[PDB]
Design an enzyme around this catalytic site. Structure first.
Site, PDB file in Angstrom:
ATOM      1  N   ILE A  88       0.887  -1.233   0.035  1.00  0.00           N
ATOM      2  CA  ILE A  88       0.034   0.056   0.157  1.00  0.00           C
ATOM      3  C   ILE A  88       0.834   1.179  -0.035  1.00  0.00           C
ATOM      4  CG2 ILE A  88      -1.939  -1.044   1.058  1.00  0.00           C
ATOM      5  CD1 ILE A  88      -1.404   0.199   3.670  1.00  0.00           C
ATOM      6  N   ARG A 119       5.531   2.994   0.284  1.00  0.00           N
ATOM      7  CA  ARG A 119       6.865   2.765   0.691  1.00  0.00           C
ATOM      8  C   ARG A 119       7.330   3.702   1.478  1.00  0.00           C
ATOM      9  NH1 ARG A 119      10.376   6.453  -1.842  1.00  0.00           N
ATOM     10  NH2 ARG A 119      12.007   5.690  -0.439  1.00  0.00           N
ATOM     11  N   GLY A 120       7.868   3.431   2.852  1.00  0.00           N
ATOM     12  CA  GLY A 120       8.403   4.353   3.498  1.00  0.00           C
ATOM     13  C   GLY A 120       9.899   3.929   3.364  1.00  0.00           C
ATOM     14  N   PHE A 131      12.014   2.716   5.609  1.00  0.00           N
ATOM     15  CA  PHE A 131      12.446   1.756   5.949  1.00  0.00           C
ATOM     16  C   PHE A 131      12.269   0.391   4.879  1.00  0.00           C
ATOM     17  CE2 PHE A 131      14.277   2.350   9.740  1.00  0.00           C
ATOM     18  CZ  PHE A 131      13.586   3.711  10.369  1.00  0.00           C
ATOM     19  N   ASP A 145       8.021  14.816  11.128  1.00  0.00           N
ATOM     20  CA  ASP A 145       7.894  14.472   9.760  1.00  0.00           C
ATOM     21  C   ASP A 145       6.292  14.801   9.465  1.00  0.00           C
ATOM     22  OD1 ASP A 145       8.501  13.534   7.412  1.00  0.00           O
ATOM     23  OD2 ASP A 145       8.960  11.630   8.021  1.00  0.00           O
ATOM     24  N   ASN A 190       1.992  12.126   5.146  1.00  0.00           N
ATOM     25  CA  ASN A 190       1.949  11.197   6.280  1.00  0.00           C
ATOM     26  C   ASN A 190       0.878  11.382   7.286  1.00  0.00           C
ATOM     27  OD1 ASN A 190       4.331  10.721   5.309  1.00  0.00           O
ATOM     28  ND2 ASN A 190       5.714  11.982   6.726  1.00  0.00           N
TER      29      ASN A 190
END
Length: 373
Positions: free
Chosen positions: A119, A121-122, A124, A235, A240
């Site tokens: 769902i 991509r971050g 990490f 952030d 976000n």
């Protein structure tokens, strides 16, 4: 009875937890846990002694587990021996077990979870939808790529560490942490409407000003709560934040977040992919993060909202944006932004952090503006 249970059901077996978390858990001399060494593929007994964790490889031969003494057909039997006899783990070390440190209530077995499609991509790695098998609770699952540098991988469990402590309608809920085996996951509530930036851009001209004000009001309530818990997010941005099926906003991506009792986080200086265009000048210049720098971020979020998801400083690089801001440059007033909201946004971006409004002020002001829409 406990000693007959397999190792993987023992309260003091912590599996794939990283060394930094081990150091967090081992508080008093003789505190211990057992875990799996991901590298060495051996079990390890980790014990606090003379103020630092000491790591002992549990040997196996003929299906008997041992250190430098007697062997036992299970690690729980070995642990019971060492604890009950108070025998040093090795003659050389003198280390003696005192207290088994248990898992907390947040640890989840991998067998409790089924992963679904990616769902997001971050920083990490991928984020997946998923479900809890026991009851079909839908979840979001944060993963960590193995190839990331060790020092960054050591920060992966920070989101869990932080969110374990919180409960608020406008903050994403932690469900559990899958640290018993690799790959390690952080499991959260699934907020079904996705990220707020996409929402703004997609729903666009359908959104009433009153609705926009309710949604940034939700953000402001979330931030006021975080401040009250000494949490500095670092952030905050529309992408976000997540939107529920009922258009309630929740703050997400706590990977960068830091808890500081005295209100100031001093950055390492080594952060990569820093969200420059969302970040306060003192935070970039001097590494000073605080709820006041989050207020700056909030002003950018307000701009994102009332522009229906425009990209900020689109004609500037990150370095150019920093130079622009030092000269007094700020983002322009969006067409759809009420005058009062822009006045508030401008205060959020006061150069001096002491001149910026509080999150309580922001929330009350947004609410008063909404009540005339």
């Amino acid at each position: 009875p406990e000693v007959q249970k397999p190792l993987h059901e023992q309260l003091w077996y912590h599996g794939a937890i990283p060394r930094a978390e081990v150091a967090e858990l081992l508080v008093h001399s003789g505190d211990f846990l057992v875990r799996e060494s991901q590298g060495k593929q051996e079990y390890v007994l980790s014990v606090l002694w003379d103020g630092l964790p000491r790591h002992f490889i549990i040997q196996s031969l003929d299906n008997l587990y041992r250190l430098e003494g007697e062997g036992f057909p299970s690690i729980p039997l070995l642990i019971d021996h060492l604890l009950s006899t108070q025998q040093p783990l090795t003659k050389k070390s003198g280390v003696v077990l005192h207290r088994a440190v248990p898992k907390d209530k947040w640890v989840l077995n991998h067998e409790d979870l089924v992963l679904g499609e990616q769902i997001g991509r971050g920083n990490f790695g991928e984020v997946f939808s998923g479900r809890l098998r026991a009851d079909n609770t839908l979840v979001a699952v944060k993963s960590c790529r193995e190839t990331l540098p060790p020092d960054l991988k050591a920060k992966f469990l920070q989101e869990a560490r932080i969110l374990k402590q919180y409960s608020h309608p406008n903050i994403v809920r932690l469900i559990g942490v899958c640290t018993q085996k690799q790959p390690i996951y952080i499991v959260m509530e699934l907020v079904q409407g996705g990220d707020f930036l996409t929402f703004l851009r997609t729903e666009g001209a359908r959104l009433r000003v009153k609705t926009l004000l309710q949604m940034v009001g939700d953000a402001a309530a979330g931030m006021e709560y975080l401040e009250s818990k000494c949490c500095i997010h670092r952030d905050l941005a529309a992408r976000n934040c997540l939107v529920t099926e009922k258009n309630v906003l929740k703050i997400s991506d706590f990977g960068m977040s830091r808890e500081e009792a005295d209100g100031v986080y001093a950055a390492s200086g080594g952060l990569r992919q820093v969200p420059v265009k969302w970040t306060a000048p003192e935070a970039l210049n001097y590494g000073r993060y605080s709820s006041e720098s989050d207020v700056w971020s909030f002003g950018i979020l307000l701009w994102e909202t009332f522009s229906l998801g425009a990209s900020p400083y689109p004609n500037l690089s990150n370095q150019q944006t920093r130079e622009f801001v030092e000269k007094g440059g700020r983002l322009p007033c969006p067409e759809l932004c009420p005058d009062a909201v822009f006045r508030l946004m401008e205060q959020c971006w006061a150069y001096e952090p002491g001149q910026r409004p509080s999150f309580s002020t922001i929330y009350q002001e947004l609410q008063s503006i909404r009540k005339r829409h």
